[PDB]
Symmetry: D2
């Protein structure tokens, strides 16, 4: 976990995120998306539960990125929830929620759901 | 947004979270759950997209909490994705993902999904 | 369950669905939405798990509706997954997935997620 | 679509489902899971939106399976929402919701979410 988490990861879409897992459960870094209404790097902050594991389980973790930087303001934020698995072929398997700011009338369709798998190798 | 977000919020289950929305999109605070394998307060970090809004839209935001503190280690993390609506009856409407650390064999059932609505009044 | 499920239900948005729970786990009926790219009634088919319950649990069930009829073809389908609770104030609590037909390029944003609560009374 | 949908499909976990897409949007068949609290075949019913597509889009569809047959009664149901893509390497990409019957107290953790990809070849 923690050490194993620190570094650069890439997913199936071609996004990249560089994160640092600090000693007490914090995750800090940047996310650069390949698709969407995103452009350049965005700031990401999150948490992981280590003290994870005498039965080779993954470490649970999650992070958030608001799609606003000095080039684009997409009026939305995405949160990724999943677990890290270390080893030869370490990966982070997640499911994500992307919510857009809407009017109360279209709030019912404000969130998209999907999944991403990240590897230390691209892809 | 930001100012409107800062403060104490409560949801339908009885949880409470106190957050501070910093000038550049950061959310920091603590979460105390009423249900679950949680006990006391946990640290939460997240982000919001303001610069939100000439058509009364909500501000998109999200946060993460790892369920580990000095009393309990649940080996899991939850991320909430949603939007803030200010006004007389301001609220944050979210959908959440709770992932548990599992073995590769039970990873397919590692995540629960649900929804929570927070108000400045309880509830 | 089954008997208790048969009838007309209404949700928070104002949609209505009339369903018949057949003896062996089948659900058949029509759905009329209030929001969306829907217009009139659409056909719905689904299943429930009864033989549900010596500890007052809800009955698990789910259904699907494709948003095509003789007035509109929205190129999408929604599935609702949840449980029925009977009693004075019986209700069906669900979470739903709405998927739209897209090109491989926008498949990552093809699904919206949300939740609906149905009562025998409107609302 | 429809014709292309009819047949036997397999997913990443090793489950199999045989379905028949009828002329007017109905899907009928059986599902046999490889993981879970399932054993043998279960009945599945659902719908698809064809009249799908001058821009090579997928056809939206969804189905439900209640995990009860003459060998097991898991007190739960799963709904799959996604789209079919035909061609050399045709597939159905979905996201699913699995809800279990619980007491009102544990209803907040009654649903798991995940994703499955089905191919005509295993896997
Ligand atoms: O990397 C990305 N994954 C997907 N989810 C999301 O929020 N934007 C897309 N980009
Ligand atoms: O406040 C809470 N909401 C629910 N989601 C979650 O992660 N734990 C439960 N507690
Ligand atoms: O009744 C409805 N609920 C929402 N989900 C959906 O698919 N369309 C909307 N209509
Ligand atoms: O085929 C399966 N996919 C997963 N989702 C589900 O409901 N059970 C598991 N089996």
């Amino acid at each position: 976990a923690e050490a194993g988490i620190t570094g650069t990861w890439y997913n199936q879409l071609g996004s990249t995120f560089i994160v640092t897992a600090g000693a007490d459960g914090a995750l800090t870094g940047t996310y650069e998306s390949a698709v969407g209404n995103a452009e350049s790097r965005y700031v990401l902050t999150g948490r992981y539960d280590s003290a994870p594991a005498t039965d080779g389980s993954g470490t649970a973790l999650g992070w958030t990125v608001a799609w606003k930087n000095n080039y684009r303001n997409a009026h939305s934020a995405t949160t990724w929830s999943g677990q890290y698995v270390g080893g030869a072929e370490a990966r982070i398997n997640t499911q994500w929620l992307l919510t857009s700011g809407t009017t109360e009338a279209n709030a019912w369709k404000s969130t998209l759901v999907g999944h991403d798998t990240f590897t230390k190798v691209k892809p």
